[PDB]
Amino acid sequence: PVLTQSPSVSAAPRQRVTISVSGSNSNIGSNTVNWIQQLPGRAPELLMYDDDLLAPGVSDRFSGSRSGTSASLTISGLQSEDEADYYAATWDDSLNGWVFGGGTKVTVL
Amino acid sequence: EKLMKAFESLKSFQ
C-alpha cells in the first residue's frame, strides 16, 4: 500500500472518529481522494469520492476532507453499523495507476 | 466524470 493509514481505531457510540491518510505529491498531493467501505462479510462499496462528496445511497453521517499530501474521513454519530474497514484511494501520477491505503478498522462499543 | 472514475478505482481495488 502506497498510502499510509493507521491500522485500527475505536470509539464509543455517537462519538466522532477521524480516519487519516497521508500520501505524497504524486498521489494525494495532486489527485482527489476516494473512500472505500467494506463491512464484515460484505463486498466493498464506494463510500466517498472527490475528497468530500458522498456516493449515491451513503449515510449523511460521513464527511471528508483533503489538504496537502493528507486526507481524512470523518464519521459522526458513530453507530454499530459503521463497524468496518475503511480504505483511502487516489490516482498516482508517478506510478500511472491507482494506489490504496492499508486500511483502518473501526470498532464500536 | 469524478464519480465514474471513483467507481473505476473500486473496480481496481476489489
UniProtKB/Swiss-Prot annotation, chain B:
N6-acetyllysine modifications at: 5
Q: Where is this region: Sufficient for interaction with TPR?
A: 1-9
**Tissues in which the UniProt entry reports expression:** Expressed in the brain cortex (at protein level). Widely expressed with the highest level of expression in the brain (nerve fibers, varicosities, and nerve endings). In the brain, the regions where it can be mainly found are the cerebellar cortex, the neocortex, the striatum, and the hippocampal formation.
The text the record gives for the protein's domains is: The N-terminal Gln-rich and Pro-rich domain has great conformational flexibility and is likely to exist in a fluctuating equilibrium of alpha-helical, random coil, and extended conformations.
What clinical condition is it connected to? Huntington disease: A neurodegenerative disorder characterized by involuntary movements (chorea), general motor impairment, psychiatric disorders and dementia. Onset of the disease occurs usually in the third or fourth decade of life. Onset and clinical course depend on the degree of poly-Gln repeat expansion, longer expansions resulting in earlier onset and more severe clinical manifestations. Neuropathology of Huntington disease displays a distinctive pattern with loss of neurons, especially in the caudate and putamen. Lopes-Maciel-Rodan syndrome: An autosomal recessive neurodevelopmental disorder characterized by developmental regression in infancy, delayed psychomotor development, severe intellectual disability, and cerebral and cerebellar atrophy. Additional features include swallowing problems, dystonia, bradykinesia, and continuous manual stereotypies without chorea. Some patients manifest seizures.
What family does the Swiss-Prot or TrEMBL record give for this protein?
Belongs to the huntingtin family.
Q: How does it assemble?
A: Interacts with PFN1. Interacts through its N-terminus with PRPF40A. Interacts with PQBP1. Interacts with SETD2. Interacts with SH3GLB1. Interacts with SYVN. Interacts with TPR; the interaction is inhibited by forms of Huntingtin with expanded polyglutamine stretch. Interacts with ZDHHC13 (via ANK repeats). Interacts with ZDHHC17 (via ANK repeats). Interacts with F8A1/F8A2/F8A3. Found in a complex with F8A1/F8A2/F8A3, HTT and RAB5A; mediates the recruitment of HTT by RAB5A.
Name of the protein described by the UniProt record: Huntingtin
Organism expressing this protein natively:
Homo sapiens
The record lists the lineage as:
Eukaryota, Metazoa, Chordata, Craniata, Vertebrata
Gene name on record? HTT
